[PDB]
Design a binder for this molecule. Structure first.
Ligand SMILES: CCCCCCCCCCCCCCCCCC(=O)OC[C@H](COP(=O)(O)OCCN)OC(=O)CCCCCCCCCCCCCCCCC
Ligand SMILES: CCCCCCCCCCCCCCCCCC(=O)OC[C@H](COP(=O)(O)OCCN)OC(=O)CCCCCCCCCCCCCCCCC
Ligand SMILES: CCCCCCCCCCCCCCCCCC(=O)OC[C@H](COP(=O)(O)OCCN)OC(=O)CCCCCCCCCCCCCCCCC
Ligand SMILES: CCCCCCCCCCCCCCCCCC(=O)OC[C@H](COP(=O)(O)OCCN)OC(=O)CCCCCCCCCCCCCCCCC
Lengths: 444, 444, 444, 444
């Protein structure tokens, strides 16, 4: 219709500008509540320009498409747009837009009272535009997760230091008795003096109790600050148990790859020590785990067991398709038979001096050497050698279909392919009875 | 029999009222132990009305059915009811009901002594009605788990602040020497003065050491408070290691859905970067993981692999039964053959521009388009198109039973069904040899 | 041979007595190092009786069998016993037995010096008998794990409070300058006075910094205590990060059963809300998860998938063997055919009003009602009913071997057995072609 | 070519020497920044000898092979070596080598200024040689993981104590007002006195706030130290939430073997208590879990399900190959038939008095006794006995191919082999129709 979708450029840059008017309007919202208690006319225009840019956006979000939850498609219908916005965030977001301190200055008051500037704390209710941006950026795959989760953990404590260093200056500044307050016991005057733009003393108190260091030079004196310190030191129990529990969740997400690798190396050194294995086979099982971690990641088979059928079969056709193409065992065969390279477990990456195929074995699989070198041997000491692109196991459908002639083992560092009795024995039926003819030509 | 079962309304509202008489009777139980040490006749009637409502419930729970543990059925037998209650919570719950301070006032005493009002601390033994309600509400599926586990974590610390701010006023109030106590060193009188209903000073001390802030304005002076601070600061080691360990368990339960999603996106970007994949296939595997998370949740296949046989087969008959009904390949077929839509993996939700079926493939499955659109193509650039309810893979049991004619790929956002060679090839035997006749009519 | 095995009664009660002489000899080992610096003749006999009971056990452990690591059998050979004990714990355990303070009093000294009573700190090296008992009791299945792991966490901190409250009294008691120490700044004399058997002041200092409360009434004054507080406050970083990390491991072991239950309920309420399921099928899938948790535990199928072959088949022969015995479909059949009740998935426990078998289905399984009641119905509203021990699905090998006549659904609370086409169709071969004869007699 | 590979001995010992010149050059880098503010000529030669050994290594790393990331092979090409080093760590590592304090002494200055010795803090940028050594040693399997991860956790806090105890002495030493600083309020002079080589006071302040103990004897006085304490106490929130989250990760890696063992024992005692099993079968299922943990580890089947095909088949040929060799059922058979001992589940280790084979069962497997003893019995009380190397189940391919004659059960402690109907029934095809002849000879 005549509705703008909630995507680029005239809306995802307007929404990024209203975030900068929430970070500002949640900094001066408890700061002018305590320190700058005049608010005559100097900052008065910025807090009304900003409050005007949040009245436009009440109008503007009756024209956004909102991306329906049960259909996963955009809704372009100005009635269902309207009933949704009027039921979730209209009675909440119009109570943060109507001016109480600027506009209702004209009735009787002087722009300052206790139960009249507390109504200006509803400009902290527009913080949901920032909290619903951290929820959106966590699922955006082009943004990091360790540096969004810590930005959410930093911005919460920076707001808890600020909003409780300005709520403990109001208890001291509005005490009818003399300086028997937390700041008055060491700095006896602290008013109309001591450089009001440097409120570092009020933040130094808040960081000392939120981190639970506690020096005791600033502490509660009157029973008004004993109530506030009880309600603040119960908040800091819940805060530091939330930062520690979140950083514990992040360290586990940090170091889970290197820890489950050191679990499987440990479990394969417990196995080769209980059974008193020789050193010549313990090195073959430990060099393989180290090379599987360097090359195949940690969970690669679980990664591409979730791709449906055609994302997986298109990965295996960019990868090693001209490897299985130009070998002699499939030469002059049709395109559609070498379009079944969909069960190649090509994640081999064998280390040097590792046996791929033993001397005699149940001949389960052929291997295709992608890059590297392999040296055949016979029962005591023989010598044959395969080159950098050949096949090393093709005598599992011929005169030795119950045995193996050589015992190959790598020399440099070799990547193989491992086609395993599902595309030569369990693929009798599709095409290519010609492959069994191409093998006997090489044996002359 | 004549026995009331432990369910609604005359028992699950009576049990909710005795919880409010435990929250009260665990607040004034250490409060009148220390501050209001008179207890002449003012609060005396409320602590005996409440103590009478706990004598009724000793009688009443000889008539409750209790829901046997090895049979999972209610026991209505007034003898086995009686032996169970007399062996678990009778010698414990009659020691919290007999009045020691009210009733044994009449022998010799004045209602106050050290070893006589400590016997009134057995009214803290009725706290098991609250602790066995948090265990019941955690397994009730109509109550939340993140806001029951934090209510249990708040009520434990609120009781630890209260019961140790009233046990450290008794050490100061009952010290025979003058004000060389923790409160006497700063407020030298603090007795018969300083507004006894405002005991905020005793809670301000307890919150300062339980959170381990520690200001040092209130500290131990005499060796009676040095013993109590040792036994209290060893409790706060075990308390804050229990709140942090529980909130770490809750944050892991909070953010496990978005963290294992960002693990699988990371593992599929490590795979497409080691193998140097082109950008045109990396976008197909990354847009699929993002859409599988939005629609199929996280573990949906593990959810409905635990439903037995008929909960699962009734889900698949409300869902997409008139989808597989009115298509041409099953038209005029019996009801009982299209009552085997029990292996439809209908959780497709394919993104736009994703290939469902390649050009040539092992023809494993037919697909039924539920909602969306799909455009067929030929080897270079062709064009055919399926509508919003048709079948896009039905040539896997006919003239191309070893191949595929088109290569379909989505355009809008499409949900499919994927019946896969278990209800057309491995269902030769039940019924419907007519389905192979309905296909040749559409090919004319 | 003539060797005692390391088991009951004359050795596992002697070893439990030497543990009580380690708990004692690790309490007075830093206590007489600092406070009771005389040690003339009063406690002198107990520290030599105890030191004699540890010289017997050097002799005695040349006659213990020790239970070999690679063979899991006891070694009774007094030579290999000897080489093992002489290589692990002989040069360590004879350095904790030879008396330096008692026995070498006779050369020149008065039983006290700095570099002579530090050699009596090697009586802390016999703590390995306690540390190797916590490792043994953790794998003993008749002892708890939550109350052994916390006893190890309590005994470590109780020793860290004691051994660092006695090492910070030696810095104050042996300072050549006057009372400008941590205790001397508030209690100026503190020597030959202030009730030496009450060293609570030295423990009150240690608990204040180990829990990191910190009051500042006792702090370091001289640069000897500034060095000790640096080496102690680096130990308390490693200590409280070890208690919090261990209690986090215990809370996860505490509450893993109720948390993964609330994960699977949540995942099945996300599934029934995205697909807009009716309320009459959402209650069937949610009442089943709640009853599977109450009765089948959490992981029962993973429990008895690890028992080898005959522990599992003997569980299923005590359980529900006279259930499958005396039914009509196996009546007059041999013992060895109803000795194949080894694939009965009897963990049914169906809730009320849950459908077991639909109206028409692939007839996969028969069910045997163990306890409860079941009511059959026909397509709209019919009525038949099975009793408390009958068979409800036996028409899957007869005239309806492609269908189902009724649609049973529970009424009370029912436990079933579910034999599923592996002991009636895939057991044609063993015995009992008579079972197909017993079915046609009941149909007359 | 003429290029040295990054391995032993002339490079992996040169790199270990430059680590000792980073540990030194990150200790005196903030130490001479604050305390030794002269730096005339005494330490001047060591900070230029060290700065010369880091100018050699800028030259030397244009000749190292670097082990390519996508090929896992060394690159010997002096052009691609050069473009890699010039793009990662050349503009970073030449800014830490050019002398600013020594070499630019000759222009105008006296070797000390604020914005001139801050440029000597770029000698902290050579710390990446230490941080990239902890990343390398974590994946080296010949080094431990619990004592590399704690060495990284100790070295971070030792640097945070040092670098913030020297940055808070510069605020006190360079304050133009008199001693109204943190150290000046208690030690009023502290300059040209109080033993400058003992800066323990500046570390005692830093350890008191980093561990959040907080005594209050040293606290901020001027508004320069109130800014530094805010920026430091926000760092200590992020530091102690990183040490606790890392030690929680290490304790879970510490005690995961004994915790999942106590989970499976608990889950098998919940199962044998709900079903009211007799004590004679509960002991058989609990003694088996305890012996499977002692011998088979925790995850042994998951260990050797990842070895490819020939590491696994060479483990089973060193292990129990002369066990299956010299038994009567395979005597005089070829080598290649007893080269298929690749499906032997030899991890039995049965406890005493445990039934291996019941009286009548589906005869699924034969067993070969490796070490131990086994006693046969008949239905009530019979007696036969197998020796220490015999076969105990071979009547599953003969006259009782639907039954079992004895019911063996162990007596001492027995390890078996369990060949299970895949090498006698599903190996009809390879060789050895002679094995069925060798069985009838033993039955005479
Ligand atoms: C130097 C100063 C300069 C800077 C000055 C300030 C600049 C401000 C700039 C703006 C900052 C942004 C502020 C808002 C950030 C957004 C916050 C947010 O999104 O947090 C939401 C968070 C939800 O949790 P999260 O982990 O995101 O959940 C994921 C799954 N939903 O939820 C939270 O935030 C949770 C926070 C934890 C709070 C714990 C409270 C525990 C309370 C326990 C009470 C105990 C009982 C007390 C009773 C005492 C009575 C006697
Ligand atoms: C009122 C008082 C009354 C009572 C008085 C005292 C009575 C004493 C009675 C005896 C008490 C028993 C004492 C011994 C108990 C046995 C201790 C034990 O077994 O602990 C071993 C434990 C091993 O760890 P655990 O988790 O058991 O391992 C499981 C897997 N192996 O290992 C541990 O213990 C670990 C302990 C943690 C220590 C952390 C140290 C961190 C160090 C940080 C660095 C310090 C040095 C820095 C130097 C660098 C300079 C910058
Ligand atoms: C206005 C301000 C004041 C307002 C006051 C309000 C009045 C209070 C209202 C009453 C309401 C609260 C009533 C009490 C709460 C009831 C909840 C409860 O008790 O829960 C039981 C809980 C069970 O544990 P949970 O983890 O739930 O177990 C799950 C699996 N069973 O178990 C627990 O809760 C366990 C408690 C944890 C404590 C652990 C600390 C013990 C450590 C001791 C260490 C000693 C070591 C000694 C070392 C010294 C060495 C020298
Ligand atoms: C007795 C005294 C003697 C003194 C001797 C001194 C000798 C020192 C010799 C040198 C010692 C080593 C120094 C270098 C340390 C080397 C280790 C290192 O840097 O490692 C990097 C480490 C990496 O992280 P790790 O978890 O290993 O990652 C694994 C997966 N990549 O990363 C880290 O280490 C991370 C650092 C810790 C994290 C700190 C978190 C702080 C964040 C909070 C900041 C808040 C900012 C607020 C913003 C306010 C905005 C207004």
């Amino acid at each position: 219709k005549h509705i703008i979708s909630p995507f680029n450029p005239r809306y995802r840059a307007w929404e990024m500008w209203l975030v900068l008017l929430v970070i500002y309007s949640a900094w001066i919202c408890p700061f002018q509540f305590a320190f700058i208690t005049y608010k005559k006319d100097a900052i008065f225009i910025i807090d009304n320009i900003v409050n005007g840019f949040f009245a436009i956006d009440i109008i503007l979000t009756f024209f956004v498409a909102y991306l329906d939850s049960h259909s996963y498609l955009l809704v372009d219908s100005p009635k269902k747009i309207a009933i949704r916005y009027l039921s979730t965030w209209f009675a909440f977001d119009v109570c943060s837009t109507a001016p109480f301190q600027p506009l209702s200055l004209l009735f009787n008051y002087n722009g300052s009272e206790l139960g009249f500037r507390i109504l200006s704390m509803l400009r902290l209710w527009r913080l949901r535009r920032v909290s619903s941006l951290f929820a959106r950026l966590e699922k955006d795959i082009r943004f990091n997760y360790f540096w969004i989760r810590c930005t959410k953990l930093i911005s919460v404590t920076l707001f808890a230091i600020h909003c409780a260093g300005c709520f403990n200056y109001l208890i001291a500044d509005r005490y009818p008795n003399p300086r028997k307050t937390w700041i008055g016991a060491v700095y006896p005057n602290f008013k109309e003096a001591s450089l009001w733009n440097r409120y570092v003393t009020a933040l130094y108190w808040s960081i000392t109790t939120l981190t639970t260091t506690g020096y005791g030079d600033f502490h509660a004196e009157n029973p008004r600050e004993m109530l506030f310190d009880i309600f603040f030191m119960m908040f800091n129990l819940g805060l530091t148990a939330y930062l520690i529990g979140n950083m514990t969740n992040l360290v586990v997400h940090w170091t889970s790859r290197t820890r489950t690798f050191r679990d499987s190396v440990r479990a394969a050194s417990e196995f080769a020590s209980r059974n008193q294995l020789p050193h010549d086979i313990q090195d073959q099982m430990l060099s393989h785990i180290c090379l599987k971690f360097k090359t195949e990641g940690l969970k690669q088979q679980e990664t591409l067991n979730n791709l449906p059928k055609a994302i997986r079969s298109s990965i295996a056709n960019y990868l090693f398709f001209p490897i299985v193409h130009n070998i002699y065992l499939f030469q002059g065969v049709s395109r559609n038979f070498l379009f079944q390279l969909v069960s190649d477990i090509d994640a081999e990456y064998f280390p040097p001096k590792e046996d791929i195929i033993l001397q005699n074995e149940a001949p389960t699989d052929l291997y295709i050497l992608v890059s590297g070198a392999v040296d055949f041997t016979v029962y005591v000491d023989g010598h044959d050698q395969f080159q950098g692109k050949a096949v090393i196991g093709e005598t599992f459908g011929e005169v030795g279909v119950l045995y193996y002639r050589p015992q190959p083992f790598t020399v440099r560092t070799t990547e193989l392919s491992q086609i395993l009795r599902i595309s030569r024995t369990s693929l009798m039926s599709a095409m290519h009875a010609h492959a069994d003819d191409g093998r006997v030509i090489m044996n002359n």
